[PDB]
Amino acid sequence: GCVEVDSETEAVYGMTFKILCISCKRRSETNAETFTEWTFRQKGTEEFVKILRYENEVLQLEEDERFEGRVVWNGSRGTKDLQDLSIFITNVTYNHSGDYECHVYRLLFFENYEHNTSVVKKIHIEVVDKANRDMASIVSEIMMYVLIVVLTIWLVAEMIYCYKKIAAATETA
Amino acid sequence: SMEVTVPATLNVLNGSDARLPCTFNSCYTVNHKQFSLNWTYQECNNCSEEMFLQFRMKIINLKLERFQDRVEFSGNPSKYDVSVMLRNVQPEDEGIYNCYIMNPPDRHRGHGKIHLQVLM
Amino acid sequence: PLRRISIKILVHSLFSMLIMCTILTNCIFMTMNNPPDWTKNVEYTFTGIYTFESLVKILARGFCVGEFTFLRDPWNWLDFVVIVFAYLTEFVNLGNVSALRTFRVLRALKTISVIPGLKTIVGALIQSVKKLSDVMILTVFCLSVFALIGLQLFMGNLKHKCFRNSLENNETLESIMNTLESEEDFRKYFYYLEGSKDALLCGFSTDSGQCPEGYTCVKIGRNPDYGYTSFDTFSWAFLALFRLMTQDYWENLYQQTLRAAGKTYMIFFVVVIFLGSFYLINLILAVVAMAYKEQNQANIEEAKCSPYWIKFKKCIYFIVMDPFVDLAITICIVLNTLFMAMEHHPMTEEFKNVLAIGNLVFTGIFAAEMVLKLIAMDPYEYFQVGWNIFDSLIVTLSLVELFLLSVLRSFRLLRVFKLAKSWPTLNMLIKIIGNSVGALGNLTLVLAIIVFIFAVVGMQLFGKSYKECVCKINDDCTLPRWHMNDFFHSFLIVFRVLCGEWIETMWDCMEVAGQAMCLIVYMMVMVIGNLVVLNLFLALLLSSFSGKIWWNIRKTCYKIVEHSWFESFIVLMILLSSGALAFEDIYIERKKTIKIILEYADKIFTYIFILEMLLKWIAYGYKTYFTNAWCWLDFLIVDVSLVTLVANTLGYSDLGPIKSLRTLRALRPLRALSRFEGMRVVVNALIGAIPSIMNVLLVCLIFWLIFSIMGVNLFAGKFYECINTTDGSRFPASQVPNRSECFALMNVSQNVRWKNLKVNFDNVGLGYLSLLQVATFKGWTIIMYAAVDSVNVDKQPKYEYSLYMYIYFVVFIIFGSFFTLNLFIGVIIDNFNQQKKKLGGQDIFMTEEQKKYYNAMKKLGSKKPQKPIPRPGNKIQGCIFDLVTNQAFDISIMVLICLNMVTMMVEKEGQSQHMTEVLYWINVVFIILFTGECVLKLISLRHYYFTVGWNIFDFVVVIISIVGMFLADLIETYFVSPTLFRVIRLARIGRILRLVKGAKGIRTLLFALMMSLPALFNIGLLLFLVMFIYAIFGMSNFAYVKKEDGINDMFNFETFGNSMICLFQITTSAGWDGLLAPILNSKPPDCDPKKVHPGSSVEGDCGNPSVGIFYFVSYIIISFLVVVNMYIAVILENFSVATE
């Protein structure tokens, strides 16, 4: 079912990027209605400006030019109880850099209880000219070869010590 | 018939307090909206019944003129108890006292009958 | 003179028969349940005959001498009482009329005396109980200790319920509680999980939980199950544990405690089920079986024109060609059966017609043959043969419906039996069945008599209550499916209890009939009823049973593989390689970093294994390498991994089956089997027995096939019903009687669905599946409700229209489960016996090193006397010492411990502060007295005291008790951990364990378990690995399935911790049907084929019906095979210890 996964923090310039905000209900069985707001403040700036609101089935995106015309919704479709809210940007640009705050509003229907809740997820993204391999990924690759070389080296060294001893035994009898 | 335990005859001295004790027993657990208890008095066997106390959500004491303010509820119905108390009994209190208990979901209605006699 | 006549009357052939005939007739009457008024006179007649029989016995025997001859025999006392109650009943009687009838029930008992040999059989069963006494104390002690541990650890836990956070009117939790008692009322306030009886259980810890947002967790109110399921009091805890020991609905208790307590407590259940249930039950079987052998064997040892018509006769008898014709017929019959096997809920007319024609040819072939046999052998000669008598009825029945009831046909399936003579096993199944009504007929008859008495007794006692209360166990105020109102129904409940299903029914008997009565009756049926069943099973089973530089290089590699570091290094890789498997789950996406290292890590592993394999080839060569079973296993695994790597590495590839090949990766833990000596040994034992196991499976399939075929004819296509989708409630049938009618409703109504069961009798394969659930007793009841309810193929099911169909299930259980299991158990244990004989009479479950250790433990058995010790020179030593060696001192201490144990029992949830302080102080005195005893033994004994093993345990317990005490105190002043505090107080249960030293009987039983620990460990290791491979297969395959029944948050396949929890439950085979239910549904509207699954790439939650069925079924069978091993290992050790 639903799992919460943090969004990627590095985006390549001039390429599409997907921002992930996933919020999971404590109990899957319960049914509630959700809506979301995403507000972004450009890097080196203070405060926040709401960029988009998604309620019901239609998505409403703020009119400002920085985010105008290059955003798409990757959230849950037709559920009306979204769970997963994600925003996809086409033609990523330098202007799209900074702190992104996404707030979720959920109406939970219980037997005689109606509950309204708010959860906030914050994602910070910095654009970059060329994508770079993560430290864990690069280090792991380098680390893997060293291990392979040592074992191979260990086996060869092992055979060499073993071979001389075996050969010597043959000579005596 | 419903299991209702009362003394068939209750003999009480004039001026003493008379507890009219009846036991009602049925399966399930009593419900306040559900449990209803009614008490009636008759001066004689064939005489018209006069309701003097009811349980409907709570105790309702009808304050019949014939009893003044001498009737009191004296039982915890949740215990299957629906007894009443007649304080400072007078000779005119002699007669027949009926307890009727209808308890949902039990369809059956219990009935206890006490013949109260007043000594001298 | 009169005495002679009476005496003459007393011993007569007819009189015993006359007394007996009347008694059997009376039994039919008891079954009335509201007999007509006219029957009363009949009642009078029965009373008179009893008195008349009694008078002759009393008149002749007594000689007016005080009836010395008459009352001397024990059996007559029962007889004397029955007549009297009737006289007494007429005479002023006690108030309880319902109670009054039960006494008359004993008349039925009188039957034991009247039948020949029943008196002998019952006495033997009772003789059996005397042996069982010691195990009983241990069960009580064992159940008692666990009850104490359970109570301390889980008291008040079942109380948790989600409670709403915001309340109108300033109400408080306490204020709300007194005000509401209504069921609807309880619901608004607390969560309540969608139509369930009680509020959802919540938890404080991160592992357990959880309550929906807007609801908070607080503990208040009654425990679930009417308050019956709780750990609050010692008595209640004892009932909960007893249920766990017999494993009745244990799956539910485990699920409930785990949810409230948190998953970490799963450990408590593993130890209790593993030691408390598997072990305790086994002990009972060994003792009953062991006891039966002595008595059975001990008793056995003491004993030791006209001529022309005849001309035709030469031809036929010459034409029978017994070499070809009889042999030809069996082959022909098997073929007909296969023809019968072809059926479905929906069949086109053309297919149906072929069945009609195929049946006729078969009808024609057998019929020609039947006439032929009699002419050749004539009627007297022909009819005499037993099989022939059997066949003519078969021919006769076929002919009768040749052109003329549905029920009549269903019998055609039986013919298939003739195959038994040729087959060796078929012979075994038939032989076992014969004993039940043959030599063991008297014993089997007792079981029938006992079941009858209980059904009637239950009916008399609780029959009236069920009808009046109803509402105390239903909403429609109508009778539940299982009830005690009628004899057939009362009988069904008793039958269910014979299978281990008592708790579900018992809660209900209690709601209507009260706790004291319901508990006593059910407990007796279970103990007494089961003992008879156990005796029959065991009795039946036992009786039935009896340059050339290349050469140097090749030598060197051999050196490397043989070397210990390498063997050791390889094993580490296997454990490490297997472990990486656990990390992949639905949550792998979070923690992206671990995912990257794991992906890279596998490549290093693939290279190491491929490298290792090459060394194997050079060292062993191809011929040696491929003639080994293990190597082939190793080679196959590296290859699958290798193909994925090249395909992944080669690139391009990654479509369809290539992905499927990857799932086989779960198979990796398998290499590990060769490496561990303990694990490998268990496998040797299994391979040895697969051929033997194989013959039986075929017999069962043949036996089951008849039942499955029979089942298909009766219920195929009749399980469909129109149900309201919102609450899944079948419509009345007053409206929507047939499928055609149901569809019209859908057109004008949104949520009505016409739907099948999912496990049913639509086809022979499905019938095979439905039958398996019924045999196991898991998930069976859902099916039976369907079978009885059913009316016709396209018609809506009426409620209990069939009613008697239950007979079909009852017969299958007796034959399908009781007999085959008897056969399954008999062959497997025997095969194990042969294996032991072959390997020089040594146990087959232990590694050589384990064997040396096992012998050392054997030494502990010896009682050679240890040195007495010397009374010190000093008087104080003499005085202090003189008291300790006294017999009274041990008894006084022993009594003291029992007194201590009773104190622990008094603790209960909600005890007042005053009670808590006294218990604390009372314990301190014991803490002081016990510490005091230890010091005293030490002053007198000195170094000698440390010599005894028991003294050391006693000394250690005191240190733990005092230390546990300080720690509890220390925690209070500086910390506030409730969970931590409960665990610390657990230290005291240690003193209770000292009770064991005093009882020699229990000590021997406990010691035996210790002996089998080495064998049990190996099986446990093997079992763990199999569970592990399955968990991995499950995580990839079943995560994402829709959550329905048995699958919900927790107890789901989403992660490795979760998968392990489920697999453990299913090991006992419990609730296996429940897990399988979500996997089965495929396609709308059962499930949505493409689902978003936020946070992940995969689409759909549809179970694979084919893959799912193989997985659950295979696991059930495999676990069962290993468990047979636990039963075998325990029995062997038990015989040896008792034997000494």
Ligand SMILES: *[C@@H]1O[C@H](CO)[C@@H](O[C@@H]2O[C@H](CO)[C@@H](O)[C@H](O)[C@H]2NC(C)=O)[C@H](O)[C@H]1NC(C)=O
């Ligand atoms: C199927 O069952 C549902 C669930 O009870 C029925 O729905 C109820 O219908 C009545 C009257 O239409 C409403 O007053 C209730 O509120 C409904 N329950 C809820 C909670 O929705 C429904 O009537 C049934 N379907 C049909 C066709 O009878």
Ligand SMILES: *[C@@H]1O[C@H](CO)[C@@H](O[C@@H]2O[C@H](CO)[C@@H](O)[C@H](O)[C@H]2NC(C)=O)[C@H](O)[C@H]1NC(C)=O
């Ligand atoms: C299936 O059930 C329907 C419903 O009763 C039967 O069809 C008719 O039902 C209507 C009510 O709409 C009655 O007026 C008719 O009398 C019913 N049929 C007849 C011939 O009386 C139908 O017969 C049932 N059997 C089927 C359709 O196989």
Ligand SMILES: NC1=N[C@H](O)[C@H]2[C@H]3O[C@]4(O)O[C@@H]([C@@H](O)[C@@]2(N1)[C@@H]4O)[C@]3(O)CO
């Ligand atoms: N001792 C039991 N083991 C089964 O796992 C249980 C499941 O199956 C069954 O048929 O009905 C329910 C319960 O009563 C069972 N009882 C019955 O067997 C069940 O929870 C869902 O069906």
Ligand SMILES: *[C@@H]1O[C@H](CO)[C@@H](O)[C@H](O)[C@H]1NC(C)=O
């Ligand atoms: C993401 O947005 C694109 C619009 O370009 C849409 O086609 C796609 O379906 C979205 N992703 C998901 C998972 O819905």
Ligand SMILES: *[C@@H]1O[C@H](CO)[C@@H](O)[C@H](O)[C@H]1NC(C)=O
């Ligand atoms: C990205 O945006 C630029 C405008 O700066 C536009 O010219 C270009 O076409 C966009 N990229 C694609 C692939 O359309």
Ligand SMILES: *[C@@H]1O[C@H](CO)[C@@H](O)[C@H](O)[C@H]1NC(C)=O
């Ligand atoms: C990009 O950002 C700069 C400053 O943040 C702004 O002046 C410019 O107008 C933006 N580009 C577009 C196309 O609006």
Ligand SMILES: *[C@@H]1O[C@H](CO)[C@@H](O)[C@H](O)[C@H]1NC(C)=O
């Ligand atoms: C709760 O629902 C109301 C609708 O009455 C809405 O106005 C409000 O914004 C919701 N709360 C939150 C935190 O979104």
Ligand SMILES: *[C@@H]1O[C@H](CO)[C@@H](O)[C@H](O)[C@H]1NC(C)=O
């Ligand atoms: C008063 O007693 C009568 C008995 O005649 C009973 O039917 C009625 O329900 C009682 N009244 C109430 C309010 O219960």
Ligand SMILES: *[C@@H]1O[C@H](CO)[C@@H](O)[C@H](O)[C@H]1NC(C)=O
């Ligand atoms: C809620 O508070 C008011 C004060 O205005 C008080 O009068 C009332 O009794 C409170 N409600 C309850 C249920 O006590």
Ligand SMILES: *[C@@H]1O[C@H](CO)[C@@H](O)[C@H](O)[C@H]1NC(C)=O
């Ligand atoms: C529903 O009724 C309509 C009549 O307008 C009919 O044409 C249609 O076939 C019906 N639906 C089904 C599934 O039979």
